Every structure is written in structure tokens, then in C-alpha cells.
Inverse folding.
């Protein structure tokens, strides 16, 4: 949200947007679908409802991304009911639509029918670090060293007149 | 017995004198000078030397000509001016160890104590160290071959005492000192692979020639320890050494933040003075 | 006494496993991070001089 | 003139061009000379030396020094040492021959 | 350019002309509890607050009843 | 509150025992076990005034003793006490949650892997609540690395010492990087 | 003794100096409270001087 900048222009700018942008994370379908168009005046009068109409079915994808930030196994009552999505097929199906993204880490397994995931969010700390911040070293040193060029040449632009 | 020697550059400059006082005859043999030094401490320390007229034959190697009276007179007058140094050994400036050099060596093994031999080079085109200390010892051999005088390399360093540094450094004005940082590090880091390259390539090619075309006990036994230690590095799998590369790479990241941060601090006076000097000299120029 | 850090260890309830480990190089990230934070006021106070002198 | 200004000017392009690698040669060589004379005036400063005592600084970068023998000496001090070591009652240490100060000693 | 700030600010004056000091005072009802409190904390407190403004706001009073029932 | 040796009944503003009653919150939440053992468990000033109310001694000794089954049984008094107060009201949402995550970090610090049985016995709560708790405390609370339920057991990794001790500074490296991009914005204009 | 290698000496005749350490001897006898022996050249230490 607006965290580190305090000015009452962006504040009034998000004064309509706040209820829906807090309504992103909990992601309740039937309520927030009414909430958007309900007081929708200027953000839905801003034109052609495009990225909010992508938002309307991005709700369950960001919510199931919070499920990816939650535990591994997918239940048929608890988390399927919790995602307002009550069937064996659509659970593994739309979770599988998050699997075909590649943004996650998951293990499609059927032993008894329950779907696993290894859900490993382990960072590269003791996991191939040299190759990992290898590119960070090269890019960062190039930025810092072209900044070294940016403190070489403007002193040339200082001593040029004299 | 003796681990290392110290040879001062004065005697090798007297080998420049060996190549000065020739007089252009057409001989240019391995002219032997009488090496002087300090056998007193366990380390050997060469201070100075002189030379003696030495002749061999064209065909015969075993004809060789020295002098005892010249040795006792030059060493006598030298001991009269400086008795803090005594006779120690000798040297020939030829690149090659002749068969006769055991017998030429034997005269100074008799009258002097256990004498050291130094092989140096007539033309200093060798990138390697010109001086090699070869201890004159008889060693017992495992094959059962009879015991003979054997020249094992004693490691050497070339150092100057005090004034030789000053005079040499005044004569050069071309060499640069230690000078840690970019240049003196990175030049060793330039030619350094060439320095092991010409060593190894200079050795294994004619060595490989003496593999197929060689006999007469080339120390065939030291090939087993040689190739053994060479096979003590069997192209390491790096799997444990991965984290070592995280270690040197993380020290590298420390050098990243130090270089970036500290140079960015050097940017301060630059990016202040660039404005405040120019615009104020400008606005008070008119 | 792990919470008061009198020694190195960490426990377990499912497996009952004890693991003992240590971190010796403490003085790198300290001096690094404090060099960053002390250079913050250098750059920001520089921007106060330059934001003073331009606008 | 007008079309001759082109090819006339090209020679000034070349003559200003030739100053580039020249100023590269100077900027690479004279800093090597700077660490030459820098290390050479550094190796003048040697640790065997005599210790005197400071009495007064009569002007900037030149002062007087009481020797251990009691005779007062007039020495232009070395430029690298800042004004902290101009303390009037100090444990100053000159050279044994150069008789210029490298460092003062803590009492 | 910063002259394209001008029609965007005409939009801003239309936004301020939607409600005239109704949101400054009423939202200042929350700001008077929220002024000088660091608003990075008010995003976390607003996050879990608005999360539990729907249901189970205090709820620690209920956990003692969740002991025997769960 | 370190002057509480010298603080006194101040009827111009605030009673001394109410000064103790208000400083027990900022100490009780905002300070850790080296902080509490350093200042107040060492300090005799709270050792005097703990005899005034027996609840406060429970909220220090059972919290410090990490006994959740009694601390949550008694924490409702901190809840109802926590509201209805003049200067102490609007943050009552924050002290609760902050104290919960500080307690869960207190247990979860010395513990690598954790069954839900000993955990549910420890808190005296159903597993259904600690399920959504720490799931909200991965993203929302942001306490530790990812927790898994393939074995239905709390397992953290927490590689927060070795490499993360170095990578706490990449944030300031990027912020200084954008700040020297601002320094580049100073250039020529 | 300021540097562990290099310290202050006090001559019998009165002027004070600072000297180095010889590569042969070690820091055992080089601790303070030890009267020593020095050279005109390089101000080196060959050995110490035991008082009596």
C-alpha cells in the first residue's frame, strides 16, 4: 500500500481504492464482486474495466497464491471450501493452472488421490550461491563502477573551464 | 646439512667481468672463478670472489688447468685485507655440467672444505634464476650402483646487503619497487602462466625426448615419485570446494561493498566542488 | 538455556534431534553494515548540500 | 575559405586527436613517477634516529627543536605531518642524520 | 513538461469537489487516532484490523470457550 | 521508565502504581529476555511493586516461563483491561497481535521442528486455530521460513545466520544504489 | 617499548635513541628492564648487557 510517503493527494487518490485493495488479499468472490461495481464510480468510469475485469478472476489466483504461501496438501473440504471451490476436479485443475505458471514449486503426486507438493521456498543460502549472486556481483559492480565513471567524467566537466 | 645459500649480485657482476676481461679470443669456455663466502653459519653467504686462468682441451674433457699458488696468493692477500670471509666453493659459467667437473670440483673438495658448485649462464636469456647451488656430496643409491659425487640442488636466494641495493638501484632507475596495488601484482599476474609455461614446456619436451630416446640411469626411480605427486591432483571434483568459492566470493562481495561505498564517498567533494567553484567564479567573473 | 544462549543447540519434538553448530565470523557483517549506515548520512547530507546549492 | 574550412579544419581534428594518447602516456607515467618519488622519500624515513624535544613553533611548517644535548636546533619540519604534532611540550623525534621528524611519542 | 500536471490537477480539483471536507474531517476521525503514529505500522495494524473488522476482532475472549470445545 | 526509582505519586498527571501499570505493557511486550532479565528481572523496583497485584507477577513469570495454557487463560484480563482506557485504547489491536507473534517467536526460536500435538498441548487450543495463525504469520506476521504440513508437523528451516547475515545488507545496497542514481540525477542539472 | 620490535634505548652518555631487533635474538631478553649493547652501524643489538 502507501507506506513510506505521506501526502494527502495520493491518500485521496486511493480513498476509493482502499476497500478493494484490502479486498485483494482475503479474496472473497461473491462479496467483493459486488463491492467493486457497488461503489464503482471513477475507477470503473476510468474506462473499459480491463485490468479490473482481469482482477475479477485474478482473485482466486492470488488467493491460491496465498495458498501457495500456505501449506502443501490440498483438502477436499477444508481448503476447497475455503477457496469457495467445492469439487475434486476444479481443485487440482486450477491448482494445476497455478502449476503451469512456473512461479511456484509443487509436486504433483497421487498415491491415494491426495495431491502433494514439496512447496520448497528455500532460498539460495547454501543452495548454489556462487552461480546465484554471481550475476548480482557482475551487474551490481557494473552499476557501481559506471557510477565511478559518473564521478570521473563530471569532474572533467568541472576542470574543463579552468 | 645446509638448507639454503645466499649469493650476492657482486659475484655475478664479476661474471659480467668474466665476460669483460676475455679480450676476444674465440674461446669463451666455462671460465671458473674461485667462489668465496661464509660457510660459517648453516646458511651459506657469498660476499665476493675472484677468478683464475682455467683451460681445458678441445677434444679431451678431462684435461683441466688450475693453480694452487694463485689460489693461495689471491686468497692470501684477500684474507690479509679481509679475514672475515674464507674459501668455500667454485662455479663455472657454462650451461652444461661436464664429466670433468667432478675432478675439477675434487681439487677444491681437497684443499678447501666441502665445496659448493654454481651453474650460471653465459647469456642471461633464461627467464629463470641463473644461479643453482649444487651440493657436492656422495649419496648411496638404491639400485646398487657404486657411490659417486652427486650434485643435488640446494635452493638459493639472491640478496644484497646494504649498499649493493643503493648502487644497483641508482644504476638502474628503470626497475620499480614492491608497489602493491594494480601494476606489480597484475604484471606477475600477466606473465605468470608464461613463467610456469616455459618452465614446464622447457622441461617435458626434451624430457619426453629422453623418454623414448634415453637410457643411462636418468634417475628412472624419481619418475615414479614425480608422476606420483603429479597424480596427487586428479582433477578435483570441487564439491567440497564449492563452499570455498562461496567463501572467496563472499569476501569478493565485501570488496564490492567497500569499493562501491568508498568510491561513492570519494564522489562527494567532486560533485560539490564541480558546482560551487564553477558557478561562483562565473557569477563573480562578471 | 538455548533461549538464553548459554551454548549451541536446537531441539525437536517430532524427531527429538539435537543439532550443534556455530557462527565464528561475526565481525564481517557488523563492520560492513555499519559502514553502510554511516555512509548513508554522507550521501544524504551531500544531497542536502546539493539540494541546497541547486534548488 | 568556406569549403576549404572543412579540409583545413581536418588537420586541427588530427592535431587535437594526437594529444589524446599523449595525455594517456603522461597520465600513466607521471603517477608511476609519483609513487617513485613517494616511496623514495618514504625510504628516507628510517627507524634508527635520535629523539629530541619540542620547544616552540615560530612560524608555519618551520620550527625550533631542543636536542637531547640541550642545544636548540632550527629545522623546517616535514610537510606530511599535520598541526597536531606542533604541540609545544611534546616528545618529538627527528632523524639521526636528516633531523626531520617522522613521529612524536606518547608520554 | 509539468504542464500535463495541470489537467491531472483539474481532475484532482474535481475529486476534491466531489466531497468538500467531508472526507478530510470524517477520515480525520481516523487520522486523529492515527496522526503522528508511524503509518508503516498503520498498514500492518490496518491490515490485520481491516482483516478482523469483518469478524473475530478481539476473539481472545472466545479462546477460553474454545478450550473445552476444541 | 528507567527513572522509576525516582518516579512518585504524581497527582498532577498520574499515580505511581498506574505508572507501573502502564510501563508493564511496554516492558512486557516491547522487551526480550535479555532485556527483561537485564532491566527488570534484575531490577528490584518491580520486585517491590509485584506484591501490589498478583496478576502482574503471573504475566511476567508465566510469560517468561512460556506457559501459554495459563497465559491465555489470564490474557483475557489483559484484553478487557487493554481497552476502555484513555491514552491506551487505539493500539489494543497491535499489542495483542505483536504479543502473539513475539510469543510464537519465543517458542519457535529454540525449536527447529515441532509436532502439532505438543504445540496444541502447549497453547491449550485446537489445531484449527494455530493452522491459520502461522499461515498468517508467514506472509502477514513474517516470522520465519516456510512451514509444511506433509507430515502435519511444524518444521522451520531458518537459514537466517550465515548467508542472510550478509544479505541483510543487500537492501541498503539497493537503496544506496538508487540513492546514487539520485546522485546521478544531480549531474548536469 | 612501543613497537614490540622497536623500542627506546637510553645511552650511558645521555642521548636517547630508538633501535631495531636482530634476526638472531628473540624477545625474551628484549623485555624492558634489560640493559643492552648496541652498534654504531644500524643501531643493531648483538647481545644484552647484564648489570652487576
Amino acid at each position: 500500500d502507501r507506506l513510506q510517503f505521506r501526502q494527502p493527494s495520493l491518500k485521496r487518490s486511493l480513498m476509493p481504492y482502499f476497500l478493494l485493495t484490502q479486498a485483494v488479499r482475503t479474496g472473497n468472490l461473491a462479496k467483493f464482486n459486488q463491492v467493486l461495481d457497488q461503489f464503482g464510480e471513477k475507477f470503473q468510469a476510468d474506462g473499459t474495466y480491463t485490468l479490473i475485469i482481469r482482477l475479477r478472476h485474478n482473485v482466486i489466483k492470488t488467493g491460491v497464491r496465498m495458498i501457495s504461501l500456505s501449506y502443501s496438501r490440498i483438502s477436499l473440504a477444508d481448503i476447497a471450501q475455503k477457496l469457495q471451490l467445492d469439487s475434486p476436479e476444479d481443485a487440482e485443475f486450477i491448482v494445476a493452472k497455478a502449476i503451469r505458471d512456473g512461479v511456484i514449486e509443487a509436486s504433483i503426486n497421487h498415491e491415494k488421490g491426495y495431491v502433494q507438493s514439496k512447496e520448497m521456498i528455500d532460498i539460495y543460502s547454501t543452495r548454489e550461491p556462487q552461480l546465484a549472486f554471481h550475476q548480482r556481483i557482475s551487474f551490481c559492480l557494473d552499476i557501481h563502477n559506471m557510477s565511478v565513471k559518473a564521478m570521473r567524467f563530471p569532474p572533467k566537466s568541472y576542470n574543463k573551464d579552468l | 646439512a645446509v638448507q639454503k645459500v645466499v649469493v650476492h649480485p657482486l659475484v655475478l657482476l664479476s661474471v659480467v667481468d668474466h665476460f669483460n676481461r676475455i679480450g676476444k679470443v674465440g674461446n669463451q669456455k666455462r671460465v671458473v672463478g674461485v667462489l668465496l663466502g661464509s660457510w660459517q653459519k648453516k646458511v651459506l653467504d657469498v660476499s665476493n670472489s675472484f677468478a683464475v686462468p682455467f683451460d681445458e682441451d678441445d677434444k679431451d674433457d678431462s684435461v683441466w688447468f688450475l693453480d694452487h699458488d694463485y689460489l693461495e696468493n689471491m686468497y692470501g692477500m684477500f684474507k690479509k685485507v679481509n679475514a672475515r670471509e674464507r674459501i668455500v666453493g667454485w662455479y663455472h659459467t657454462g650451461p652444461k655440467l661436464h664429466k670433468n667437473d667432478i675432478a675439477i670440483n675434487e681439487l677444491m673438495k681437497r684443499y678447501c672444505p666441502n665445496s659448493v658448485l654454481v651453474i650460471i649462464d653465459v647469456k642471461p636469456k633464461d627467464l629463470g634464476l641463473p644461479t643453482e647451488a649444487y651440493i657436492s656430496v656422495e649419496e648411496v643409491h638404491d639400485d646398487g650402483t657404486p657411490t659417486s659425487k652427486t650434485f643435488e640442488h640446494v635452493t638459493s636466494e639472491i640478496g644484497a646487503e646494504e649498499a649493493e641495493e643503493v648502487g644497483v638501484e641508482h644504476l638502474l632507475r628503470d626497475i620499480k619497487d614492491t608497489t602493491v596495488g594494480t601494476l606489480s601484482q597484475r604484471i606477475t599476474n600477466q606473465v605468470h602462466g608464461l613463467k610456469g609455461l616455459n618452465s614446464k614446456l622447457l622441461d617435458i619436451r626434451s624430457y619426453l625426448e629422453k623418454v623414448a630416446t634415453g637410457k643411462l640411469p636418468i634417475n628412472h626411480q624419481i619418475i615414479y615419485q614425480l608422476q606420483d605427486v603429479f597424480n596427487l591432483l586428479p582433477d578435483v571434483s570441487l564439491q567440497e570446494f564449492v563452499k570455498a568459492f562461496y567463501l572467496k566470493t563472499n569476501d569478493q562481495m565485501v570488496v564490492v561493498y567497500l569499493a562501491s561505498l568508498i568510491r561513492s564517498v570519494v564522489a562527494l567533494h567532486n560533485l560539490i566542488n564541480n558546482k560551487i567553484a564553477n558557478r561562483d567564479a562565473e557569477k563573480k567573473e562578471g | 538455556m538455548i533461549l538464553d544462549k548459554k551454548f549451541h543447540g536446537i531441539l525437536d519434538q517430532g524427531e527429538g534431534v539435537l543439532i550443534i553448530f556455530d557462527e565464528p565470523p561475526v565481525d564481517k557483517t557488523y563492520e560492513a553494515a555499519l559502514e553502510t549506515i554511516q555512509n548513508m548520512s554522507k550521501v544524504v547530507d551531500s544531497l542536502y548540500n546539493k539540494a541546497k546549492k541547486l534548488t | 575559405d568556406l569549403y576549404s574550412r572543412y579540409k583545413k579544419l581536418q588537420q586541427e581534428l588530427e592535431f587535437l586527436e594526437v594529444q589524446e594518447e599523449y595525455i594517456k602516456d603522461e597520465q600513466k607515467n607521471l603517477k608511476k613517477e609519483f609513487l617513485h618519488a613517494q616511496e623514495e622519500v618514504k625510504r628516507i624515513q628510517s627507524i634508527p634516529l635520535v629523539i629530541g624535544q619540542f620547544l616552540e613553533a615560530v612560524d608555519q611548517n618551520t620550527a625550533i627543536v631542543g636536542s637531547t644535548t640541550g642545544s636548540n636546533y632550527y629545522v623546517r619540519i616535514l610537510s606530511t605531518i599535520d598541526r597536531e604534532l606542533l604541540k609545544p611540550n611534546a616528545s618529538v623525534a627527528l632523524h639521526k642524520h636528516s633531523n626531520a621528524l617522522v613521529d612524536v611519542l606518547p608520554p | 513538461m509539468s504542464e500535463k500536471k495541470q489537467p491531472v490537477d483539474l481532475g484532482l480539483l474535481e475529486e476534491d469537489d466531489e466531497f468538500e471536507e467531508f472526507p478530510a474531517e470524517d477520515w480525520a476521525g481516523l487520522d486523529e487516532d492515527e496522526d503522528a503514529h508511524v503509518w508503516e505500522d498503520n498498514w500492518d495494524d490496518d491490515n490485520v484490523e481491516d482483516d478482523f473488522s469483518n469478524q473475530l476482532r478481539a476473539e481472545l475472549e472466545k479462546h477460553g470457550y474454545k478450550m473445552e470445545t476444541s | 521508565f528507567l527513572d522509576t526509582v525516582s518516579t512518585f505519586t504524581s497527582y498532577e498527571l498520574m499515580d505511581y502504581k498506574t505508572f507501573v501499570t502502564y510501563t508493564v505493557y511496554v516492558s512486557m511486550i516491547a522487551l526480550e529476555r535479555p532485556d527483561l532479565r537485564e532491566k527488570v528481572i534484575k531490577g528490584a523496583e518491580i520486585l517491590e511493586v509485584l506484591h501490589s497485584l498478583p496478576a502482574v507477577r503471573q504475566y511476567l513469570f508465566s510469560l517468561y516461563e512460556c506457559r501459554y495454557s495459563v497465559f491465555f487463560q489470564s490474557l483475557a484480563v489483559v484484553e478487557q483491561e487493554m481497552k476502555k482506557d484513555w491514552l491506551f485504547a487505539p493500539h489494543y489491536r497491535y499489542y495483542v497481535r505483536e504479543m502473539r507473534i513475539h510469543a510464537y517467536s519465543q517458542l519457535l526460536e529454540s525449536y527447529r521442528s515441532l509436532t502439532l500435538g505438543y504445540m496444541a498441548e502447549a497453547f491449550g487450543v485446537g489445531v484449527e486455530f494455530i493452522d491459520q495463525e502461522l499461515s498468517r504469520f508467514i506472509a502477514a506476521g513474517r516470522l520465519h521460513c516456510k512451514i509444511d504440513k506433509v507430515n502435519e508437523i511444524v518444521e522451520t528451516n531458518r537459514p537466517d545466520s550465515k548467508n542472510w547475515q550478509y544479505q541483510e545488507t543487500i537492501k541498503k545496497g539497493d537503496l544506496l544504489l538508487n540513492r546514487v542514481q539520485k546522485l546521478s540525477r544531480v549531474i548536469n542539472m | 617499548q612501543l613497537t614490540e620490535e622497536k623500542f627506546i634505548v637510553k645511552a650511558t652518555n645521555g642521548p636517547r635513541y630508538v633501535v631495531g631487533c636482530r634476526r638472531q635474538l628473540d624477545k625474551s631478553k628484549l623485555k624492558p628492564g634489560t640493559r643492552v649493547a648496541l652498534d654504531m652501524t644500524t643501531l643493531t643489538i648483538m647481545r644484552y648487557l647484564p648489570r652487576e
